[PDB]
Design a protein around this nucleic acid. Structure first.
Ligand SMILES: [Zn+2]
Ligand SMILES: [Zn+2]
Ligand SMILES: [Zn+2]
Lengths: 101, 25, 150, 91, 81, 127, 97, 160, 97
RNA sequence: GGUGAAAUUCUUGGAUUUAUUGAAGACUAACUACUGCGAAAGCAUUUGCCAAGGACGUUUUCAUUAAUCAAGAACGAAAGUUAGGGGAUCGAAGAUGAUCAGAUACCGUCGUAGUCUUAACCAUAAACUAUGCCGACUAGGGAUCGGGUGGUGUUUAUGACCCACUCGGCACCUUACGAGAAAUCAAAGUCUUUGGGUUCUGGGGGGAGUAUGGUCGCAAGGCUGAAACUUAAAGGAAUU
């Protein structure tokens, strides 16, 4: 839990409400930074990977360290086919045609 | 002038002898 | 002129003037042939044997105790190596630093001297080929260095 | 002979796709196809399994690493930062 | 200074000279007798020594090498021989 | 016999702060600026406009119980430009008017073990 | 600096290399002062130092691993664990502790 | 104290618990004042710094320092008076033996009592005879890291 | 011409050291070049301390003095500090009196 | 806040000063100097590891192994470039308050790329000591770092300090009857009393590091690089 860590550590896969079984920092290679405690009023502050902050309670769970598999956005999809192979596993949201058409 | 800005004028015309003399076939 | 760094000093030796010397010593050469070959069962580092007797015994130079230098002494009784005395140490310095260069690899300052000292490896090699103390065309490359220096 | 001058792996693609869309790729898959130092034996027997899985052919150990390495750049600073933290509570 | 006698100098110049720049150059080191405090035999160790050579039976200490002169540092003597 | 406040003036350039506090720190008393007393904005560095600031600061503190004080001055401080100006020499005499009880007058201008380089460009703010 | 101290063990006396030849020796007491790497699998880091506690010999933990003990003995391949049989002229067996 | 010529060695005091309208502070550490250091600096001399982390009887893990300048000795002709610069990394480990070896040990009722009459500086007079005797050496800072928790028990030794 | 022997900056045989910046104009100058001076002042005015510090129990406590080291530059020194020129053959001393 | 004055901005949404603190990145002040290491650009917090380098001691060892280098190579501050990371401070582009007849110039507040690093890149700078390397001679002194020697020296066997030295460094001072057009110089001296080796470069200024190609670089750009035509001085030094 996030009261058994002291300040400055670098956690991920924590849960919003205690019992959620992991809801944030689940993606391929991110992290939530602890940005300040308070012993009383048992709600810790954090640092979310986009620009927002958040206050959650100390009974939230959480794994330590950044998620593996990250840093994959750097290579281009670079042809049509191995972009089509990517979406075919996930959902039908591709090709997205345009609105002036 | 100063020879720092005589050199700046004679370096940004080498992007004009290189450009418009090239496509002019 | 030091040829690689900008020193100018003279930190060297100065042999005495006398040839016949030193008018105190005991029995001459005929106990001192093998008295150095006795130690030379330890290898050995051949130019070092002049200085390990000297600080302990009166041996002062090879001109005094016998009438020969310690290449012509040591070779005749079947001891002297193939690559005898300095180029064995000079490529030993070459093979030592290239092991350091396969690790950290950012040393632009320290592989500078490996292009510098290997200009010394070739130079003493093709002196030794010119006088044919080492046979000519001398296959030398640092791939098989540790099988050559050992 | 020498096969190709500066194309390298991207002769696979050929004339298409542009320059910088092939330059930025080819630096990265030499960190993907090629082997590494398996730290549980020392020998060079680890290659890619999947998207971030780096198994070893001997030793049967799989390392969950980055997408094109076994330890990334952001992965380097966290492992130092953790044993920063283990000696404000232990030592 | 306009005149000297270079062949016949004084006596206080040679001590102010060096190993390597006298009229006819010679050494400053000198072979030297020490017998051990324990043993009786003399190994001719000289004070401008090297690696710490000692007597052959009881090699306790006879010389310690430094940046300059090695030293006796204990017990018996130095003759000068 | 006495009870000690901490005067601890801040006589930076283009301003002058002064406020007595408890030595606990987290119970301050009545800060007063160069803009409190007189208003022309030329008067941020006059002598007699700097003495009036400590004048209202002093007799307000005796109404609470601050009899003795610990003056411990501060200039601009840090990589901010380190030197005392027209306040610390001048307005400390405006604590002597009360006969108020002083001590320990040296500075707490913080000292950069050089870091996080200054402003004004490399070449400097030429006029 | 024990890396020079291991560099004269081999030229002065007898030894072994590899796992099986070390534990070939500990089962008749002829071994002394087995040397252990650091990235050996910790089963066999303990499976020999258990009986090394029973066969009276002392243990050393070389800080490097398999591919670091190879150059500190002179050979040019991996070596996990070095037993030395006799090092009769060497600065090792008394200089520990 | 009132013994005023200890006008150096500035002290912070940890105020911990209010003992029934008579709150009694606990120990925090030590500083100098911010100019006794600077009133010792001077050109044509050599400097030092050193530090360590160290435990105590409990685990008030703290990080002390030590500063020591260089004396103009007797019969000086030079103005410079600089030390060896290989002995600087021979003094800074022996002094970082004695500032260690008193601590790891040194309860905060006896590390405190050693630190007030500056007993420790007399040891450098007696054990840094090696390379240079010294001029003024002082400890200059102690600051904690790891007070374990509130510790209502052992605070009660400090009272009237 | 070479209007001074060490024309710039008291620097012979090293090339480059670091810059350290001026205080008032904040020009960047290398620290070997422009200006040394210590400026000790005091920290009190004309004190009249016998009744300034009769209030100060633990009497007068300090004779309080501060230290400041400065770094001017070449381009701003002669607009405060009184040299502003020197002649040809008098540029030779180093002690200030 | 801010300067000589004024404001944008931040303000009873509690700022600015304060106190307990954490973080995040860059930077190692004060010592720090006529002082060091490095081939040159450069290199200042602690310790460890790796291999390297100059100096000195030598009554070791080889016996001309050497100097300078066309071609061909390694390193090479800053700004740049490609793609990642962490993005505190400063801060070209930009917006804004003032000044200005005039400000997209100086000043004041914000501020993107950069700054730092990891893989790769161009190879330029006042990359200056405007003084190519090797060698040997020719004035006097005082300091200074490193090594060594010797002093019945001081401090308490050791270290530091003093003294007389010596060798190699960075320089300095006093003068030079020599050299230099002069400023200046222990080398710019041993040169019309005209010869110790060896590499490179320059011939009046502009046109012009331009054009044409060659050639390297992904790019900015680099190395090699003329001519037509034009004009009688541009320059160096010190005097009033
Ligand atoms: Zn494995
Ligand atoms: Zn012996
Ligand atoms: Zn300035």
């Amino acid at each position: 839990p996030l009261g058994s860590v002291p300040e400055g550590t670098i956690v991920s896969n924590v849960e919003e409400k205690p019992g959620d079984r992991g809801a944030l920092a689940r993606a391929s290679g991110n992290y939530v930074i602890i940005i300040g405690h308070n012993p009383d009023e048992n709600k810790t502050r954090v640092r979310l990977p986009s620009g927002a902050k958040k206050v959650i309670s100390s009974d939230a769970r959480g794994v330590i360290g950044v998620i593996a598999g990250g840093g994959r956005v750097d290579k281009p999809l670079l042809k049509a086919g191995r972009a089509f192979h990517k979406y075919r596993l996930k959902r039908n949201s591709w090709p997205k045609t345009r609105g002036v058409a | 002038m100063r020879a720092k800005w005589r050199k700046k004028r004679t370096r940004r015309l080498k992007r004009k002898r290189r450009k418009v003399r090239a496509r002019s076939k | 002129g030091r040829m690689h760094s900008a020193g100018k000093g003279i930190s060297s030796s100065a042999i005495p003037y006398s040839r016949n010397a030193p008018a105190w010593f005991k029995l001459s050469s005929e106990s001192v042939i093998e008295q150095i070959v006795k130690y030379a069962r330890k290898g050995l580092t051949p130019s070092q044997i002049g200085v390990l007797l000297r600080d302990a015994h009166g041996v002062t130079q090879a001109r005094v105790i016998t009438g020969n230098k310690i290449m012509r002494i040591l070779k005749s009784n079947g001891l002297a190596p193939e690559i005898p005395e300095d180029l064995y140490y000079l490529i030993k310095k070459a093979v030592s630093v290239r092991k350091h260069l396969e690790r950290n690899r950012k040393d632009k300052d320290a592989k500078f001297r490996l292009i510098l000292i290997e200009s010394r490896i070739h130079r003493l090699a093709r002196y030794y080929r010119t006088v044919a103390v080492l046979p000519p065309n001398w296959k030398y490359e640092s791939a098989t260095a540790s099988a050559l220096v050992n | 002979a020498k096969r190709t001058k500066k194309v390298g792996i991207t002769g696979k693609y050929g004339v298409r796709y542009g320059s910088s869309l092939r330059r930025q790729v080819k630096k990265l898959e030499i960190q993907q196809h090629a082997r590494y130092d398996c730290s549980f034996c020392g020998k060079k027997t680890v290659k890619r399994g999947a998207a971030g899985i780096w198994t070893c052919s001997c030793c049967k150990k799989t390392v969950a690493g980055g997408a094109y390495t076994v330890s990334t750049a952001a992965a380097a600073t966290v492992r130092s930062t953790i044993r920063r933290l283990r000696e404000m509570v232990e030592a | 200074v306009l005149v000297q006698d270079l062949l016949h100098p004084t006596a206080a110049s040679e001590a102010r000279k060096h190993k390597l720049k006298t009229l006819v150059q010679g050494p400053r080191s000198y072979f030297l007798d020490v017998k051990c405090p324990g043993c009786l035999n003399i190994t001719t160790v000289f004070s401008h020594a090297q690696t710490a050579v000692t007597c052959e039976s009881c090699s306790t200490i006879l010389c310690t090498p430094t940046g300059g002169k090695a030293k006796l540092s204990e017990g018996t003597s130095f003759r000068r021989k | 016999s006495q009870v000690f406040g901490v005067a601890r003036i801040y006589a930076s350039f283009n301003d002058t702060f002064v406020h007595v506090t408890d030595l606990s720190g987290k119970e301050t008393i009545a800060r007063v600026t160069g803009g409190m007393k007189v208003k022309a904005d030329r008067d941020e560095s006059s002598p007699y406009a700097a003495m009036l600031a400590a004048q209202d600061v002093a007799a307000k503190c005796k109404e609470v119980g601050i009899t003795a004080v610990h003056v411990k001055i501060r200039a601009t401080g840090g990589t901010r430009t380190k030197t005392p100006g027209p306040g610390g020499q001048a307005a400390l005499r405006a604590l002597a008017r009360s006969g108020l009880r002083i001590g320990r007058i040296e500075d707490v201008t913080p000292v950069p073990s050089d870091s996080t380089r200054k402003k004004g460009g490399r070449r400097g703010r030429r006029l | 600096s024990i890396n020079q101290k291991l560099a004269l063990v081999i030229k002065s006396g007898k030894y072994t290399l590899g796992y099986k030849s070390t534990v070939k020796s500990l089962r008749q007491g002829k071994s002394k002062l087995i040397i252990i790497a650091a990235n050996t699998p910790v089963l066999r880091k303990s499976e020999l130092e258990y009986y090394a506690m029973l066969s009276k010999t002392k243990v050393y933990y070389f800080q490097g691993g398999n591919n670091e003990l190879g150059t500190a003995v002179g050979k040019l391949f991996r070596v996990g664990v070095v037993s030395i049989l006799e090092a009769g002229d060497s600065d090792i067996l008394t200089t520990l502790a | 104290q009132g013994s005023e010529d200890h006008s150096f060695r500035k002290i912070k005091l940890r105020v911990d618990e209010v003992q029934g309208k008579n709150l009694l502070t606990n120990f925090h550490g030590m500083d100098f004042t911010t100019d006794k250091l600077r009133s010792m600096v001077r050109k044509w001399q050599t400097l030092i710094e050193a530090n360590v982390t160290v435990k105590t009887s409990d685990d008030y893990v703290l990080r002390i320092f030590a500063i020591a300048f260089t004396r103009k000795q007797a019969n000086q002709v030079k103005r410079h008076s600089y030390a060896q610069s290989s002995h600087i990394r021979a003094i800074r480990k022996v002094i970082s033996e004695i500032l260690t070896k008193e601590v790891q040990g040194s309860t905060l009722a006896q590390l405190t009592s050693k630190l007030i009459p500056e007993v420790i500086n007399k040891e450098i007079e007696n054990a840094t005879k090696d390379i240079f005797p010294l001029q003024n050496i002082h400890v200059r800072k102690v600051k904690l890291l790891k007070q374990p928790k509130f510790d209502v028990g052992a605070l009660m030794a400090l009272h009237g | 011409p070479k209007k001074r022997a060490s024309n710039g900056r008291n620097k012979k045989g090293r090339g480059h050291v670091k810059p350290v910046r001026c205080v008032n104009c904040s020009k960047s100058i290398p620290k070997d070049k422009a200006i040394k001076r210590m400026a000790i002042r005091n920290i009190v005015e004309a004190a009249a301390v016998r009744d300034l510090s009769e209030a100060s129990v633990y009497p007068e406590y300090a004779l309080p003095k501060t230290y400041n080291k400065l770094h001017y530059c070449v381009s701003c020194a002669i607009h405060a500090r009184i040299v502003r020129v020197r002649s040809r053959e008098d540029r030779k001393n180093r002690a200030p009196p």
